[PDB]
Write a protein that binds this ligand. Structure first.
Ligand SMILES: CCCCCCCCCCCCCCCCCC(=O)OC[C@H](COP(=O)([O-])OCC(O)COP(=O)([O-])OC[C@@H](COC(=O)CCCCCCCCCCCCCCCCC)OC(=O)CCCCCCCCCCCCCCCCC)OC(=O)CCCCCCCCCCCCCCCCC
Ligand SMILES: NC(=O)C1=CN([C@@H]2O[C@H](COP(=O)(O)OP(=O)(O)OC[C@H]3O[C@@H](n4cnc5c(N)ncnc54)[C@H](O)[C@@H]3O)[C@@H](O)[C@H]2O)C=CC1
Ligand SMILES: Cc1cc2nc3c(=O)[nH]c(=O)nc-3n(C[C@H](O)[C@H](O)[C@H](O)COP(=O)(O)O)c2cc1C
Ligand code: SF4
Lengths: 55, 430
């Protein structure tokens, strides 16, 4: 994504495909390495009533 | 007869309940006690059991087992062990203070009941486990037992009948669970008053491992009246399987808190409006009634309009008769604080023996202590219901039942009031 448009055009002509639209080297479009803290959901047995284990 | 109550004073068993006459022997013999006791003693145990089984006398302790059928469990030949009548005189129940009145104001009626009932069950002697807090009542009873000994009514050749019978009084030591018959047996035997498991029912192994019948003060004190007046006289009051007369303690939010004898199947509204002077603020100011002492679940004003004060009509009203102690709670009552105080009673009065009561009654106290403030979410109401269903029926004695039932009554009749309590906590605190 730092290639010159001469090399970019030669490369697109040589592969026959558009390569800047689908780059295999990853850049700022990917997810952040630091994420907000999650709040994970609980399951169906996390209840206080009608939760007999034998049932 | 279909309408009950309005009981005449000629049909009261407990004359001199109010202390307006002499409680001593010259008073009791001038009211009907100790009259032809020898002619009841000399007709054998079988006639006395026939008169009590005919009379429909159920257990005045609170469960209402047939007292004649209960006493006929002792009608058996001896195996070398003596037999014992034991009179349960603890009465630690909230709302219930009638046996205090019987011991304090009709002691000779209780002593003649001890003699006649012990003749009916072949008992050697009578241990009256009186409450330790009823000290003046206990010395009162001991003076009357001294008067019964010195007149030759009890002791060696009781009432001139060739029958020997002593009457012992054992004071309690401040434990509600010692009113339970097997824990009362353990408290007489000088141990921790912890309830035994059943079987052996105490007619097999009771106090000291002897055959034993534990009977309430009221269901003992009415027995000479049943022997003299007859079984048909006692069965002529109240419905079938609901016979007799009954003492009632109407306390709480009433104008005149009182103890009164009344016919068995009396309506609750008639009883409160007649003998108690009505609810404070009138009958329309009524919120709830704990019908029969603290263990029985409460009933609201929509049930209190047409309900009757006996065993079957209260079991049909998804509560119990219990000790027939009416605790009246008006519309100004924080009912959650009262029932949480009642569960605080049942964990302060719990002997700690088996797992569900020892753990779950404290855990229901903690849940109810959060329900008073509202510091809980409504998924803990049904949870609490399940906790009551894990104490009801899984304990040794029925104090787990008596602690799970008021929670169930408060939930079953006032779930929306608990939910609005908790949601107003959640909106003014979050
Ligand atoms: C074809 C013959 C060679 C022509 C020069 C050439 O192709 O230069 C690369 C130059 C850049 O190629 P690119 O792959 O697009 O590089 C993009 C990078 O962002 C550009 O890279 P950058 O952004 O990292 O820029 C820094 C880069 C700058 O790169 C250069 O200076 C390239 C070297 C030029 C000499 O310098 C270096 O990385 C230092 C390299 C040092 C050693 C160079 C050795 C070269 C051979 C001589 C010995 O190529 C062109 O511009 C297209 C070819 C032009 C041909 C003209 C007619 C001949
Ligand atoms: N009077 C008071 O101060 C208080 C009374 N209670 C009452 O106590 C009751 C719970 O007491 P429990 O004795 O556990 O109830 P219940 O199940 O046992 O039985 C009542 C009586 O019947 C006898 N009995 C029942 N079936 C028998 C059988 N097959 N063979 C021999 N005897 C038999 C028991 O020994 C007991 O004396 C409750 O209904 C409650 O209302 C509770 C608290 C205080
Ligand atoms: C926790 C508990 C406490 C009890 N306390 C008393 C009591 O204080 N006085 C009483 O007469 N019965 C009490 N009972 C009921 C007795 O177990 C028993 O039913 C009664 O004393 C005698 O039975 P009867 O009524 O058939 O004669 C209590 C029961 C339980 C489960
Ligand atoms: S359930 Fe409670 S009252 Fe009964 S034996 Fe156990 S600790 Fe005692």
């Amino acid at each position: 994504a730092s290639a010159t448009r001469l090399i970019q055009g030669l490369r697109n002509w040589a592969s026959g495909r558009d390569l800047q639209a689908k780059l295999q080297l990853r850049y700022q479009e990917i997810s952040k390495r630091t994420q907000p803290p999650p709040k994970l959901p609980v399951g169906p047995s996390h209840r206080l009533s009608n939760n007999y284990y034998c049932a | 007869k279909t309408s009950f109550g309005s009981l005449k004073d000629e049909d009261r068993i407990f004359t001199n309940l109010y202390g307006r006459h002499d409680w001593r022997l010259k008073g009791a013999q001038s009211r009907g006690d100790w009259y032809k006791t020898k002619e009841i003693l000399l007709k054998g145990p079988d006639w006395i059991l026939g008169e009590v089984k005919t009379s429909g006398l159920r257990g005045r302790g609170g469960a209402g087992f047939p007292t004649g059928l209960k006493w006929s469990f002792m009608n058996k030949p001896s195996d070398g062990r003596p037999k014992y009548l034991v009179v349960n005189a603890d009465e630690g129940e909230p709302g219930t203070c009638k046996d205090r009145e019987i011991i304090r104001h009709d002691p000779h009626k209780l002593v003649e009941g001890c003699l006649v009932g012990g003749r009916a069950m072949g008992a050697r002697a009578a241990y009256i486990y009186i409450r330790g807090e009823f000290y003046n009542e206990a010395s009162n009873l001991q003076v009357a037992i001294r008067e019964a000994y010195e007149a030759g009514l009890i002791g060696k050749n009781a009432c001139g009948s060739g029958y020997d019978f002593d009457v012992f009084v054992v004071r309690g030591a401040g434990a509600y669970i010692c009113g339970e018959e097997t824990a009362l047996i353990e408290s007489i035997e000088g141990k921790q008053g912890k309830p035994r498991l059943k079987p052996p029912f105490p007619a097999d192994v009771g106090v000291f491992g002897c055959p034993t019948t534990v009977a309430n003060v009221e269901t003992v004190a009415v027995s000479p009246t049943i022997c003299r007046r007859g079984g048909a006289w006692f069965a002529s009051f109240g419905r079938e399987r609901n016979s007799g007369t009954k003492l009632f303690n109407i306390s709480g939010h009433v104008n005149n808190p009182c103890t009164v004898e009344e016919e068995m199947s009396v309506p609750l509204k008639e009883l409160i409006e007649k003998h108690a002077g009505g609810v404070t603020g009138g009958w329309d100011n009524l919120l709830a009634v704990i019908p029969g002492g603290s263990s029985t679940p409460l009933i609201p004003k929509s049930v209190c309009e047409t309900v009757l004060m006996d065993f079957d009509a209260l079991i049909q009203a998804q509560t119990g008769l219990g000790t027939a102690a009416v605790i009246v709670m008006d519309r100004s009552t924080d009912i959650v604080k009262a029932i949480a105080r009642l569960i605080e009673f049942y964990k302060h009065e719990s002997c700690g023996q088996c797992t569900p009561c020892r753990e779950g009654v404290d855990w229901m106290n903690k849940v109810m202590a959060r329900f008073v403030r509202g510091d809980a979410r409504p998924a803990e109401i049904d949870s609490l219901w399940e906790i009551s269903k894990q104490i009801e029926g899984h304990t040794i004695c029925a104090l787990g039942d008596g602690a799970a039932w008021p929670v169930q009554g408060l939930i079953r009749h006032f779930r929306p009031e608990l939910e609005e309590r908790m949601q107003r906590f959640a909106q003014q605190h979050q």
